Design a protein around this ligand. Structure first.
Ligand SMILES: [Mg+2]
Ligand SMILES: [Mg+2]
Ligand SMILES: [Mg+2]
Ligand SMILES: [Mg+2]
Ligand SMILES: [Mg+2]
Ligand SMILES: [Mg+2]
Lengths: 212, 226, 196, 222, 233, 204, 125, 195, 196, 195
């Protein structure tokens, strides 16, 4: 697995791979590692697939109840803390979770919270989680700027997953892109890594080591 | 694996299924489990397949040299003794479980050998994962003074019980008949009750379906003259 | 396994069941556990079949070579060779052997060699998993200088009970009679001994 | 120590067509190297045009299917005989599975049917309830033998159009129910040849707008 | 979680044209000790069902009491207790199957393998298996423990599939069962010669046979077998 | 931990009409980490071809060992070794390390120069010969390969048809295995010409 | 005890002759005639069974010996030396070939192995 | 030890190796050179278990120096790497294996080409344009995959190497105390004293 | 421990040795293992002394309360109460109990309750570590409808052999006779039973 | 987390806490503030198991803030430290104990004195002139033992703190990404933004 999310001028980019494995066996290449909590909030899937799916879906129910009671959009801070407090109750039971709760509100602006099954809750600008996280970090760190355009930021997220997909055996299949704005997230398509690799190799001149 | 040995009037018959597996996967659907120690001494192996083949070739090799040295046709008791002492020395680490059968100047013989080096004598024996299914058939239908034709029938029926009821066994039945005063007749694929049905579809691809990056001629020939 | 050897007036008789198990599966129901190491020196085997066969084969070799040089060996000598193998290799063996033989000078003798590799000369010996159930019976019913027919009945009744209670024992009751007259094999089937 | 789990073998296969869906499964039930039954139905009609199979440990499989069938019944009672849509069934099954998160149903569940637009739908579940709508999914013992074949023959993976040489992919043309059944049968015939736990019989449940239909085929019994 | 102490071995069974046959030996083993020789492991429920049980005997006796209690309970406020609302094999099995799976789910199983054999109201043959894990399956032939490995192969030669059931008579079916019991006595170290056999026929009803023995055994060939290889005497 | 699945990779071999084909992926890894996309697993000694999956150090070591042995064979025999003979040599060599084995899955492929008969063979790590008529599979996606081969294969395929079958068998099997892929090579072998083709595949 | 003859008993004389080899050839010269003829579809090897006594059963003394199913040997010279060479030749056909390649050695290579054994008796201690 | 990197550019091989030596709780040294010159145009860096690393490296060095004297000839980098691989392949089935991973950077004077060989403690050899051992590749390979070109100059290789080290210094939990960088080319081996 | 209960013509007799060991140390050489749960319903205890005492005390309580309400309980009822405790608490108990009693209607009855908590009604029962050695003897020598004197001899001879072979058994042979006449205690010392 | 230091000088308490947050292989953050303001003149830094640290710190914060509102009064640092110790002492015999070590730096407005309390996850409280948790003390205490004076100014305390951090940066294997330093005095709590 490789999942990333980073804050920038235009909001948040969320990018994930699509591969799921059981040992060496590739169980699925079409897995959705971005949970659409609601139209404004996104969550990433790493570690336990069920744990992330179930609780981040449950999550959307809690937020919906919040805004019904309070007549106001829930904050990303309150949002992420509902999840972190929940998994913390289960601490020791064996939940496996590494996720980025991503959102864009008025009071906060674009916000990302890394939430963990150990109970860790970290606000930050760039996060990368999964078996291919180190590969994605390299591309991110060397190319990231706050003043990236929405177009360039989307490509950076896509390219960073591709970097991991190539090197990390347990990452690949396809890349899912999201762009989170204040008015809600916008889906930017499914991109097959096989076709994307050759496309990027040619257009960018990267991956000279690989014969194409 | 299902292997059996059955004594009869003027000799002995052994039989085996033809399925070899790596875990739950069928590696070879037509494996040859009936091995030759000498022309008229054959054995069937279960357990670690490499060990059964390796130990029969080694003893078979030493049996041949012994036969040449003594100017005598090899005896089953010699193969038995050499197998058990070898297997005992390695204390079960050589995972060979054998049914040894044959004819020699002394007569017709049937023995089983376990990996730790213990041997047994019998008129009917079965080894392998399908040995219980096979032994059920042998215990139900075996009798004294079987004919050649009855023993082949019983042996193959016992293998079939393993084929159908034991997941570790399948495919075909191999048989070898060793009769006194005769050449041993190896009956490869004596029964073939598991032919795959014709598939619903042909999966022959159109030529040029596969994407290719490079082509080249490989030089298998030696360095050339001139 | 249920095995025993009993001395009597004319010599000694070895007795055994015929069941060999791998767990709860009877791998061989007609096993011959009475094995010959010399003309009139036999043994009953219990424990690891591989070990006891290997031991017996080596002893038979030793007594055959002994005979070629020094003439017929005593039963004591055979027991000593068994003991030497069992004792010196105690870490790698699981063998419980009863040695029984007939000399003309010494007559019927029985030696038992348990797991440790010790030797115990006895009037009679019982061993194997099924022996536990007949310690009481055999102790109450054994007499010295029994007749051949009495000793056969004693062994038959003893092993019948051992078989009845021990799941690891069963099949036929094999016996080998060792006297001056020679070597006689006996067999007794379930229908005979179960109704006793 | 008591082991509450077991492996009953078996292999199942769900394929979603354009206006239909099939859920197939072999009828062999096993423990270790023994056959329990040559015909033990594994794929079930659960009502509301939904078919289900929970492959793996058969006791948990039967328990889950039983509880889901029960959930369909109570969904009718509680919501004025409303039809349980395949997506709603799928979400319900997630909660059934995740309910036992810390003592899981040791099964790989697949359901099949039609979505609310009448298109073919297959959903695939892991033991603890993570689920996903899919076009093609083999489950169980010979899943690793079947899925690569399906990638190639259903989705036309690694297949390109002759003459172009890797430049133009083979177009993803829609398969008919007759075409799918051929691939299902060949998948299981191949699985039977190379997997010891697969054999005896193949039972296929076909779901259309007209209802649920069954087809049975013999497999090799060795 | 426990371990079985006093145990019963194979229960074997099969369908025939008009009903089902089920058999099990009368032994209650205590490990390798053949402790109890008069244990009835076939327990009839009414006149249409016989439950055959292997494994832990103390749990069998508990199950035996549950079935006895089930008959009592079914008769309460039930004028048709001996007619339309009598206990069916299917009712009895589903009840046991529920209990077995519930008990395994509490990590406190009934350490048994059970075969419920019977004939339904409409004359249909009922034969289904359930064990300590709550695993259930049906087949023309069913057997527990060693029976699964040795009896099934023999019984499957008679009824190899569903279509062979109407072709199989009660005499052929019983013969196959009795032969299988002999084979198990030859080869199962935890079996006894004495067994019980029950036939549930849609016409002649429940026939329960006690004190049966394995007979026509082959042992004579043992006399010729000598040594373990080279020994001649 | 498991030596046969640290480095990953696969080999498949097939027989056709008067021809054999042997193919392999190009991946070498350290578990999750991809290390090389040029690690070829097929070698040849004269006209006899050997594929080797498993622990990469042993793959290299055994190649060097069989080059060594087939070179001495040729000098003494005054002729190139045949597939049937080499198969026995591979088996002998593996079994001599019975209690300290090379963690490999070798696959022999070739055509007998005298009889013209197509030949393939497979081995377990310990030397047991699998002499199949149809096909041999090996490596971390051997299950996938068994599935592909069993359905795709038909007997007596012509060289250029066999190429398509074995290629599609390899590619689609490798795409369902995390530790296989990163390129592929296919050898099409005829009695006196051998064509080597590198395949284009997804690089993840 | 111990074999204290660890030195060569065959050595070069001043003239460059290896005496013990020449003397061995002299012993071969005294030996009974044996011959070999190669045809297009076969080979024949033959010799005289020089019976040391008419009471001796000359059938029990095999001057012509099978080495492998496709290889045979005959000799001239010292019979006992031949007999042990046949034993070694048979064994070496298995140990250094059949157990490696799963087939019997070709004639020239088995001959090479026999030659090696005879060479070593010409140089070893 | 920890991080060892290698990159083969147009006309040279560059090896970067960490300076830290940590024995449990304390960093005992921050200037350790994890490399040995095997021959004038062949350099080997190394990382693995303490003691084994230097023992192995010096053992290889001695053997190559012996060969150089005997034949009055420098072995090709390929020949040296094969010799090293065999020693490690021999080692892995020994009583106590050498727990040592190495990179061999050499300039082949015959072919006029730089060559980088990566060999792990099992004897797993691969010729690469750029390589690493341990966790080093996890952080650096994505950058190398992106920026690397086979026609890079030595100065460009060093700049790409700096970017790799910067990423390591940012995301690695361990303080490896910077790297010693050495360049292997036609003129021999030299150390970049400012990095 | 060596314990047994034997039905005979006039009723039933319980028999037991008196040895209680902690490892190889005899903690009590004069133990009373024949314990009273009702006037004419007694039991023989084997296994954990703490467990079997705790069980017996609870049963005695239950039968005392039963008697106050419903009159004298049957031997079957007593065995059922034992079974209920042993079966339901099988995970935390190591108890092997033989229940023996005398009704006027049913006469002498013997029930054995092994480790699992099953119940087995038998003509006679043997249990404890020393019982293994007398399965053969007891099976051969037991007859139904023996006299009081014969049953005492049968139990005395049986436990004598059990004691002889089992190190865990020994001391005196205690017996309790249950008949219409009443309750009679018997004791037999080493000098008496060892010479048998 | 890793390193947390504390030093009580003449008229203030200074807490220094590392910025790194490492989750296994990668450093996820290099600007993490491992501290919570319990009351206007009481600051608590913390280090221990992930999740537990922040959960515990915020739980304490909420309780002290509740007390402050109820009584309209700020609890003394001693009172707060005793409350915190009891919670940890209660925690250690719980089903799942808080794996959290804390330093409580407070200025007692009644006594006009700075106070530093060191409490480990067992509920082991000690009042100290300077303190640490984990391995931090092993590197720093020898320097603090040497240089510390009870009449030090805040500026001198910071200089001694820099020397402690420099020694940590030299000899510790882990890169803790520097420290956030906060000062607690009569005027309240403030952060030293350049360190
Ligand atoms: Mg990948
Ligand atoms: Mg042993
Ligand atoms: Mg018995
Ligand atoms: Mg199959
Ligand atoms: Mg892959
Ligand atoms: Mg490497």
């Amino acid at each position: 697995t490789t999942t990333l999310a980073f804050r920038f001028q235009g909001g948040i980019i969320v990018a994930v791979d699509s591969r799921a494995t059981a040992g060496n066996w590739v169980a699925s290449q079409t897995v959705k590692k971005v949970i659409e909590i609601n139209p404004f909030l996104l969550g990433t899937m790493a570690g336990g697939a069920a744990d992330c799916q179930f609780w981040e879906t449950w999550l959307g129910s809690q937020f919906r109840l919040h805004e019904l009671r309070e007549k106001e959009r829930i904050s990303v801070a309150a949002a992420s803390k509902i999840l972190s407090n929940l998994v913390y109750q289960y601490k020791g039971a064996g939940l496996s979770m590494g996720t980025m709760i991503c959102g864009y509100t008025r009071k906060e602006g674009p916000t990302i919270y890394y939430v963990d099954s150990d109970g860790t809750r970290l606000k930050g600008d760039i996060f990368c989680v999964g078996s291919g996280q180190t590969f994605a970090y390299g591309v991110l760190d060397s190319n990231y700027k706050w003043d990236l355009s929405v177009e360039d930021a989307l490509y950076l997220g896509k390219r960073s997953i591709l970097a991991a997909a190539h090197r990390d055996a347990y990452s690949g299949g396809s890349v899912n892109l999201y762009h989170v704005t204040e008015d809600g997230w916008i889906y930017h398509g499914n991109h097959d890594v096989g076709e994307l690799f050759w496309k990027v190799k040619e257009e960018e001149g990267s991956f000279n080591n690989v014969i194409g | 694996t299902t292997i059996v040995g059955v004594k009869f009037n003027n000799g002995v018959v052994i039989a085996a299924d033809t399925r070899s597996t790596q875990g739950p996967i069928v590696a070879d659907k037509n494996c040859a489990k009936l091995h030759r120690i000498s022309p008229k001494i054959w054995c069937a192996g279960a357990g670690t397949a490499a060990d059964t083949e390796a130990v029969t070739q080694l003893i078979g090799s030493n049996i041949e040299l012994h036969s040449l040295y003594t100017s005598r046709e090899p005896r089953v008791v010699s193969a038995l003794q050499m197998l058990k002492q070898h297997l005992f020395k390695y204390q079960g680490h050589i995972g060979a479980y054998l049914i040894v059968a044959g004819v020699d100047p002394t007569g017709s013989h049937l023995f089983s050998i376990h990996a730790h080096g213990s041997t047994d004598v019998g008129y009917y024996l079965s080894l392998g994962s399908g040995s219980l299914a096979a032994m059920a058939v042998l215990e139900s239908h075996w009798k004294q003074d079987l004919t050649k034709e009855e023993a082949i029938k019983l042996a193959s029926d016992a293998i079939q019980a393993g084929i159908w009821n034991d997941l570790g066994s399948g495919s075909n039945v191999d048989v070898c008949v060793m009769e006194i005063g005769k050449d041993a007749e190896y009956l490869r694929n004596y029964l073939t009750p598991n032919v795959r049905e014709e598939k619903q579809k042909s999966y022959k691809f159109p030529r040029g379906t596969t994407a290719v990056l490079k082509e080249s001629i490989v030089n298998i020939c030696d360095i050339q003259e001139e | 396994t249920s095995i025993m050897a009993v001395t009597f007036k004319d010599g000694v008789i070895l007795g055994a069941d015929s069941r060999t198990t791998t767990g709860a599966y009877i791998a061989n129901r007609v096993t011959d556990k009475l094995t010959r190491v010399h003309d009139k020196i036999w043994c009953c085997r219990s424990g690891s079949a591989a070990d006891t066969q290997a031991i017996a084969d080596i002893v038979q070799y030793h007594l055959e070579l002994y005979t070629s040089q020094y003439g017929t060996p005593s039963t004591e000598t055979a027991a000593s060779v068994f003991k030497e193998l069992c004792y010196e290799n105690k870490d790698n063996l699981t063998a419980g052997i009863i040695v029984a033989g007939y000399d003309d000078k010494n007559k019927g003798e029985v030696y038992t060699i348990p797991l440790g590799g010790s030797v115990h000369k006895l009037p009679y010996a019982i061993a194997g998993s099924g022996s536990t159930f007949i310690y009481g019976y055999c102790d109450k019913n054994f007499r010295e200088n029994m007749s051949k027919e009495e000793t056969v009945d004693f062994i038959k009744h003893s092993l019948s009970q051992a078989i009845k209670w021990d799941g690891s024992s069963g099949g036929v009751i094999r016996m080998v009679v060792l006297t001056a007259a020679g070597v006689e094999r006996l067999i007794f089937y379930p229908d005979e001994y179960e109704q006793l | 120590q008591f082991n509450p789990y077991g492996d009953n073998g078996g292999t199942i296969l769900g394929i979603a067509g354009e206006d239909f869906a099939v859920l197939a499964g072999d009828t062999r039930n096993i423990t270790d190297y023994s056959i329990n039954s040559r015909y033990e139905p594994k794929v079930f009609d659960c009502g509301d045009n939904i078919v289900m199979s929970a492959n793996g440990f058969a006791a948990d499989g039967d328990a889950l299917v039983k509880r889901f069938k029960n959930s369909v019944k109570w969904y009718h009672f509680d919501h004025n005989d409303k039809k349980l849509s395949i997506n709603s069934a799928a979400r319900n099954i997630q909660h059934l599975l995740y309910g036992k998160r810390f003592f899981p149903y040791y099964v790989h569940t697949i359901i099949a049917g039609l979505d609310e637009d009448g298109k073919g739908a297959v959903y695939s579940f892991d033991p603890v309830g993570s689920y996903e709508r899919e076009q093609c999914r083999a489950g169980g013992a010979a899943a690793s033998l079947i899925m690569p074949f399906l990638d190639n023959q259903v989705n036309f993976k690694n297949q390109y159009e002759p003459g172009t040489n890797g430049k133009v992919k083979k177009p993803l043309k829609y398969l008919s129910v007759e075409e799918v059944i051929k691939l299902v049968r060949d998948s299981f015939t191949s699985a039977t040849e190379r997997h010891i736990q697969v054999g005896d019989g193949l039972e296929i449940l076909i779901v259309t707008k007209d209802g649920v239909r069954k087809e049975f085929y013999e497999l090799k019994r060795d | 979680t426990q371990q079985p102490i006093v145990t019963g071995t194979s229960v074997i069974s099969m369908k025939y044209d008009n009903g089902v046959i089920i058999a099990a030996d009368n032994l209650g083993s205590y490990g390798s000790l053949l402790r109890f020789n008069g244990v009835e492991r076939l327990i009839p429920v009414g006149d249409n069902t016989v439950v055959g049980i292997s494994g832990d005997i103390s749990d069998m006796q508990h199950i035996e009491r549950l079935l006895k209690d089930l008959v009592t309970e079914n008769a309460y406020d039930n004028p048709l207790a001996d007619a339309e609302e009598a206990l069916e094999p299917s009712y009895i099995f589903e009840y046991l199957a529920t209990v077995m799976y519930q008990r395994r789910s509490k990590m406190n199983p009934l350490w048994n393998a059970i075969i419920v054999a019977g004939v339904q109201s409409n004359g249909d043959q009922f034969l289904r298996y359930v064990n300590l894990l709550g695993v259930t399956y049906s087949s023309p032939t069913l057997a527990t423990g060693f029976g699964a490995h040795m009896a099934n192969p023999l019984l499957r030669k008679v009824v190899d599939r569903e279509s062979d059931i109407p072709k199989t008579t009660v005499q052929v079916a019983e013969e196959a069962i009795v032969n299988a019991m002999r084979v198990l006595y030859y080869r199962d170290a935890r079996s006894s010669r004495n067994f019980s056999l029950a036939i549930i026929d849609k016409n002649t009803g429940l026939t329960f046979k006690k004190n049966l023995q394995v007979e026509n055994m082959k042992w004579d060939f043992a006399k010729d077998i000598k040594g373990y290889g080279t020994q001649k005497i | 931990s498991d030596p046969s699945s640290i480095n990953g990779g696969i080999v498949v071999a097939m027989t056709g009409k008067d021809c054999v084909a042997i193919a392999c992926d190009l991946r070498l890894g350290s578990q999750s980490l991809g290390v090389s996309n040029k690690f070829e697993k097929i070698f040849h000694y004269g006209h006899v071809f050997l594929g080797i999956t498993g622990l990469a150090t042993d793959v290299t070591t055994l190649n060097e060992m069989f080059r060594y042995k087939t070179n001495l064979y040729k000098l003494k025999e005054e002729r190139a070794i045949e597939p049937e003979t080499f198969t026995q040599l591979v088996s002998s060599s593996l079994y001599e390390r019975r209690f300290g084995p090379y963690f490999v899955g070798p696959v022999v492929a070739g055509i007998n120069s005298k009889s013209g008969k197509p030949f393939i063979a497979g081995f377990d790590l310990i030397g047991c010969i699998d002499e199949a008529k149809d096909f041999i599979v090996s490596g971390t996606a051997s299950d996938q390969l068994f599935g592909m081969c069993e359905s795709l294969y038909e007997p007596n395929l012509e060289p250029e048809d066999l190429f398509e079958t074995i290629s599609q068998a390899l590619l689609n099997a490798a795409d369902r295995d995390a530790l296989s892929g990163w390129g592929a090579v296919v050898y099409i072998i005829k009695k006196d010409e051998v064509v080597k083709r590198y395949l284009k595949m997804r690089q993840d | 005890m111990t074999d204290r003859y660890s030195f060569s008993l065959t050595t070069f004389s001043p003239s460059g002759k290896l005496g013990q080899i020449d003397y061995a050839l002299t012993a071969v010269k005294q030996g009974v005639t044996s011959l070999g003829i190669k045809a297009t579809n076969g080979v024949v090897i033959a010799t005289e069974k020089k019976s040391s006594s008419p009471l001796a059963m000359s059938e029990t003394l095999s001057k012509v010996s099978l080495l492998t199913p496709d290889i045979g040997a005959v000799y001239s010279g010292m019979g006992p030396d031949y007999r042990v060479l046949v034993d070694k030749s048979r064994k070496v056909a298995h140990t250094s070939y059949k157990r490696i390649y799963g087939e019997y050695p070709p004639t020239k290579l088995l001959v090479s192995e026999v030659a090696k054994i005879m060479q070593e008796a010409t140089q070893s201690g | 030890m920890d991080i060892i990197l290698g990159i083969r550019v147009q006309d040279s091989v560059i090896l970067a190796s960490s300076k830290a030596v940590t024995r449990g709780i304390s960093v005992l040294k921050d200037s350790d050179d994890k490399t040995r010159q095997l021959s004038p145009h062949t350099l080997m860096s190394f990382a693995g278990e303490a003691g084994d690393t230097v023992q192995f490296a010096e053992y290889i060095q001695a053997n190559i120096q012996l060969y150089s004297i005997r034949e009055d000839y420098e072995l090709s980098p390929q020949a040296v790497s094969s010799f090293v691989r065999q020693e490690l392949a021999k080692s892995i089935r020994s009583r106590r294996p050498y727990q040592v991973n190495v990179l061999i950077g050499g300039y082949d004077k015959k072919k006029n080409k730089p060559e980088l060989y990566q060999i792990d403690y099992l004897g797993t050899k691969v010729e690469l344009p750029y390589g690493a051992h341990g966790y080093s590749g996890f952080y650096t390979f994505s950058l190398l995959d992106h920026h690397y070109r086979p026609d890079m100059t030595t100065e460009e290789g060093l700049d790409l190497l700096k970017l790799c080290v910067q990423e390591l210094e940012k995301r690695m939990p361990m303080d490896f105390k910077g790297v010693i960088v050495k360049i292997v080319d036609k003129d021999g081996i030299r150390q970049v004293d400012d990095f």
